[PDB]
Amino acid sequence: AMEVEVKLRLLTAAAHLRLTTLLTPYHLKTLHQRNTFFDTPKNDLSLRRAVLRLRFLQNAAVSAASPSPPRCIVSLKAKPTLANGISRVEEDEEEIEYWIGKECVESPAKLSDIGSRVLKRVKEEYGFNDFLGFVCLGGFENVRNVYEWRGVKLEVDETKYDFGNCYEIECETEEPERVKTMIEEFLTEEKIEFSNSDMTKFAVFRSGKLP
Ligand SMILES: [Mn+2]
């Protein structure tokens, strides 16, 4: 399925602080995310412009009385385009058990035990019989604030790489040009410095430096 989202870079931590402060009345939830990625040592998926990700996440305000495991989501993203602050990608995602997700990080071959259609698709589309040749590339942490604002869900990200923090605003939408304009007018009015995001979080991770 084709996913579309507006993707804007917030240019400083101060801009990000100002934004999160202003959006506080619209706050829906806060997600703590850890993203991990998988490929062959020869970057077979990356060369076919495919990204295979296991995300571990928890709601920061999860009930203290009723604890639950962190959620684990496997996602395959393919045929990406990112230009003019609009990201388009073919995406397939599926939830899996926390414990098996964690074991796949240490042993990517175990990705076949899962019996996940997403991973069956990786095999069939890209010509793998199994994940015996895969490594975990590692990954990074993200704090995602979700807001319900002017009819859309805004996602404000603080991505914490080893080489420093990056800040983004995202919005999933079928009307990216209208929504992008709406967001930009707001940021402009509030003097929150921004630009188009021209790199995915994974690309920034792999570059090993701030964009
Ligand atoms: Mn995104």
Numbering used by the authors: 0 to 210
What do the study authors state?
We determined co-crystal structures of AtTTM3 with tripolyphosphate and Mg2+ or Mn2+ metal co-factors in two independent crystal lattices. As AtTTM3 efficiently hydrolyzes PPPi in the presence of Mg2+ ions only at neutral or basic pH, we used two crystal forms grown at pH 5.0 (form A) and pH 7.5 (form B) to crystallize substrate-metal complexes under non-hydrolyzable and hydrolyzable conditions, respectively. In both crystal forms, we determined structures of AtTTM3 in the presence of PPPi and either MgCl2 or MnCl2. At pH 5.0 (form A) we find a triphosphate moiety bound in the AtTTM3 active site. Here, PPPi coordinates a Mg2+/Mn2+ ion that acts as a bridge between the substrate and the invariant Glu-169AtTTM3. The same metal co-factor coordination has been previously found in a Vtc4p AppNHp-Mn2+ complex. In all our structures the catalytic Mg2+ ions can be substituted by Mn2+ ions, for which we calculated phased anomalous difference electron density maps from data collected near the Mn-K edge to confirm their modeled positions. Comparison of AtTTM3 and Vtc4p revealed that four basic residues, which lead the growing polyP chain away from the active site in Vtc4p, are specifically replaced by four glutamate residues (Glu-2AtTTM3, Glu-4AtTTM3, Glu-90AtTTM3, and Glu171AtTTM3) in AtTTM3. These residues, which form an acidic patch in the vicinity of the AtTTM3 tripolyphosphate substrate, are conserved among diverse TTM proteins with different catalytic activities.
